[PDB]
Design a protein around this ligand. Structure first.
Ligand SMILES: [Ca+2]
Ligand SMILES: [Ca+2]
Ligand SMILES: [Ca+2]
Ligand SMILES: [Ca+2]
Lengths: 14, 145
């Protein structure tokens, strides 16, 4: 995952 | 929370609340993450929901989303500030505040402690007894209510 995807997925995985 | 912040969080919520009904469900959360790759499991999905569903009613609403986004922003902000505070003391940046470092920091900041008082300040925070203050020890000092 690149950071753009990482930023999105963290909204709910973090 | 500023308007600015809430508005960023509104957009973030919208992305997951596919139908716009004000609520994020597990199906929804799957469909969206699949619309975007992801391929997680009904296990993973049930958890993500539970971790955020304050009232237990089964889905995430905006009030609950907001609470979660606020907490995470505040948590990170605090962490970054405490790290910055630590660097004000830990002069050589080796991860430990020595008595020598504290004393010279005290003199630079225009504070006035004797050497025995510098030692009291170290001992106070020195949970593991190594005669220095590492980062976690420092956090407890900065966290003290
Ligand atoms: Ca929905
Ligand atoms: Ca709920
Ligand atoms: Ca040091
Ligand atoms: Ca220590």
């Amino acid at each position: 995952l690149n950071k753009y995807q990482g930023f999105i997925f963290d909204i709910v995985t973090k | 929370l500023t308007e600015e912040q809430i508005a960023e969080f509104k957009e973030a919520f919208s992305l997951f609340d596919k139908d716009g009904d004000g609520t994020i469900t597990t199906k929804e959360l799957g469909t969206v993450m699949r619309s975007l790759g992801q391929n997680p499991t009904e296990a993973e999905l049930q958890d993500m929901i539970n971790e955020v569903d304050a009232d237990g009613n089964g889905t995430i609403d905006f009030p609950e989303f907001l609470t979660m986004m606020a907490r995470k922003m505040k948590d990170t902000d605090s962490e970054e500030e405490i790290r910055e505070a630590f660097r004000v003391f830990d002069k050589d940046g080796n991860g430990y505040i020595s008595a020598a470092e504290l004393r010279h920091v005290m003199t630079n900041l225009g504070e006035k402690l004797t050497d025995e008082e510098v030692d009291e300040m170290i001992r106070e925070a020195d949970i593991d007894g190594d005669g220095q203050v590492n980062y976690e020890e420092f956090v407890q000092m900065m966290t003290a209510k």
